[PDB]
Design a protein around this ligand. Sequence first.
Ligand SMILES: C[As](C)(=O)[O-]
Ligand SMILES: [Ca+2]
Ligand SMILES: [Ca+2]
Ligand SMILES: [Ca+2]
Ligand SMILES: [Ca+2]
Lengths: 181, 248
Amino acid sequence: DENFLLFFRLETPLDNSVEFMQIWRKYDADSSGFISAAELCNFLRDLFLHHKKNISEAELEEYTSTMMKIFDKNKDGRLDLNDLARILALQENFLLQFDASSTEERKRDFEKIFAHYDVSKTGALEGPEVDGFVKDMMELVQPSISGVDLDKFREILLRHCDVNKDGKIQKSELALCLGLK
Amino acid sequence: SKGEELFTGVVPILVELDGDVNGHKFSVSGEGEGDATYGKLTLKFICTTGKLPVPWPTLVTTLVQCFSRYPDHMKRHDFFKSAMPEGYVQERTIFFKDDGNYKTRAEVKFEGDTLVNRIELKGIDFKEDGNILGHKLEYNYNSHNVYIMADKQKNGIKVNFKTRHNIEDGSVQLADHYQQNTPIGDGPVLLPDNHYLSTQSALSKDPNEKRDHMVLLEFVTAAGTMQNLREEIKQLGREVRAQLKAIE
Ligand SMILES: C[As](C)(=O)[O-]
Ligand SMILES: [Ca+2]
Ligand SMILES: [Ca+2]
Ligand SMILES: [Ca+2]
Ligand SMILES: [Ca+2]
């Protein structure tokens, strides 16, 4: 058939926004809010060598160029958040899984939600755990977020729910600012 | 509920107003239909006595709030449809700041399959070249909320809101509405918790009508009442949204 397209077979979909934000935070090296061609090639170079398939850098440039042509919606040379969510095959917003008005059913759902975004099992949301939650939460109230806004968004969210002012969102803090027991 | 049952589909509407404002007598006949499922009202009004002595926007409020869309978790608060088909009395005093005042009494009831609004209006103390009798108001309407409170005393509801009517000047004429609603035919009605009605009105003209007239499109919806976790996640998101838009 065709060279390339290997990457889609290599791509297993992502269930969680936290892991998407880790990849996004990792390859936006200049913190510009978008993914350049140079940065995308860095991402593809690492993705391939973890699978130990081997690629001369000539066709790494070629496949990077092919991926920009396909997923750069407005041909500005920059992939934004949703341009990369397509690449990494991020699935439907996790928060859409949820009528429960009881006080104990809401605590049950809050546990499932906080468990989803606390990948680190520390009991507090930190780093790309905040971003993943912020992305899924903001896309319930407005069209979609820009990569430049998420540094603004995290700052705002912490000033809302960081009661002890330590820089991370403990379980109790997120429960309290959602209005829960 | 049977009252709530009467507004399932499209209901034809008839409106008849007979008014007395600073001596000038006039009458208005209104035809149209209402769709409560969407909180929609299309109506055409015609002055049968020739030229109208007051501007049309000053009559929109008086010229049938039973066609408001009540979100189904607010149906308990739908008072205007709980008084049907026997209907209710709507009494208003409308104070125009630095001008006169209308006092209206109206019966809104079902006469067959047609919803009917018959109104007597008395306007007094107006100023002959205030914005009302001088016809200085702009032909449009401004959306606003209509605040509803229960009145256990009179087995009805007290309602209060201010409308603002633009003038050519860029000025604004303030009208202070005070109104009470009481069942005509006695019976069990629903007295609601404090809430408001979001209403917007568009005013047009039929190109083929030479009589003084007003074509009216209206949308009314109930809100202001309150749950699950995602809605708490939503209002946390709306508050985050609000904060980001400030620092910009
Ligand atoms: C940005 As899209 C929802 O078309 O992948
Ligand atoms: Ca970048
Ligand atoms: Ca782009
Ligand atoms: Ca954690
Ligand atoms: Ca904290």
